[PDB]
Symmetry: C3
Subunit: 172 residues, 3 copies
């Protein structure tokens, strides 16, 4: 009970636009008052599988949400499936984003956001932005939201990313 994670393989665990179209790899490790997080994404099918902004310039972003109840347990309306989220060998308030650092919705402060850049197919001229926001969803006690977005014109690029590390302040 120091790491909460998805399994590290590439089997689909996540639904963005159609069922089980993606594999989110998310590893949360509790280092006392901070959670060390490591994230990457493979889209395996559907709308976001192959990006072509030549033919669809307005398809530029999508969102994966993780919603948690008051005990830190993943809710079923999350994009990530509950069967795929477990401690490495179910309550987990110590992994939740701190509500004083990152308050629930209602102008708020930007420190509840972390930005990073990952790269599609591992190619250094294929950046995409991963925007991570804490506790800004409703209908839950805690949340972590990943928004993936890009501004370059990609032409038939498969959406599979390099890895990004961040941290956040833990609820307890």
């Amino acid at each position: 009970t120091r790491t909460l994670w998805t399994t590290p393989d590439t089997s689909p665990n996540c639904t963005i636009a159609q069922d089980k179209d993606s594999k989110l790899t998310l590893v949360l490790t509790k280092c006392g008052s901070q959670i060390l997080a490591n994230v990457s994404l493979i889209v395996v099918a559907g709308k976001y599988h192959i990006i072509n902004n030549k033919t669809n310039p307005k398809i530029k972003s999508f969102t994966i949400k993780l919603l948690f109840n008051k005990n830190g347990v993943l809710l079923d309306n999350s994009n990530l499936g509950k069967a795929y989220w477990n401690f490495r060998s179910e309550k987990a308030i110590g992994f939740m984003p701190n509500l004083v650092a990152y308050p629930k919705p209602s102008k708020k402060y930007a420190r509840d956001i972390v930005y990073g850049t990952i790269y599609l197919g591992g190619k250094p001229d294929q950046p995409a932005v991963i925007k991570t926001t804490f506790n800004q969803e409703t209908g839950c006690e805690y949340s972590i939201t990943f928004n993936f977005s890009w501004s370059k014109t990609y032409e038939n690029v498969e959406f599979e990313t390099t890895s990004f590390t961040f941290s956040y302040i833990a609820q307890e």
Copy 2:
């Protein structure tokens, strides 16, 4: 009583003096993971010269610095920009009740990051990151963190915030950035 975390608390009460007294909230969390300190930082400027950036009027106002200076016991010195009242080991969402006496285990390692008297200054005592003003992706600013480069102290962490875009009425309140550094002991 989390003896592995030194922090500012996560509230929004100003705790830092950049240009005028208590004009900002520096949120800084230092978590000891053995030989490395995991650090998380953000800044909210609430008043004064840096609260609203307008480079149309003053195109030369493009940076400022926040210094944390520590003595030989790792205790924050009063000439730091960060106030001492707010800086302590964590208890819940607040601080432990009494001011700490020793925190050498959280200081930047002096062999990795030597004092300015050193023969050679090495760039490894610097970490660069980018944060975003108002959380907007087209409002980057650079946070440059430097270890042990101040004088008049045993240890120091310096944050320099700067930007190169011409911002017009942009409030200086940032997204969060994580880094680490090698601990003294």
Copy 3:
């Protein structure tokens, strides 16, 4: 002390790494085990040889180099790594423990997360990109590309590829520091 949770190069400036000439650089690498994740901190000081002072007006083709750490099934550094074995060990104070370690599997990159090379589809999650700055100057970026388990002739590997695209003129290759993490094998 005797810090079993840190595998490192020590933090001194003694050259320990061979890029183009023997012991022409100091790779400062600290691997700190936080359970299932390794917290990693890296920087590079080149002190001699062809990558010490970059001048792309005179040498326009010098734009990248790679430092490889290769490990066996026990997580022991192999002798054909760029990093010397004498310098790589568990931590004691600001130095290393006295005897060379025999097992460090808990610090190796996870083989399920970062599979070895094959003929099947290769996925990007075994790469982390960062930007560091030469001489600490904000207008002298270089890219550090870290790749897990993509070398052959080993059980595990961490490789650091350094590259840049600006035309630098007499710039000393000493980098700022970069932190990343990766999923541990055990």
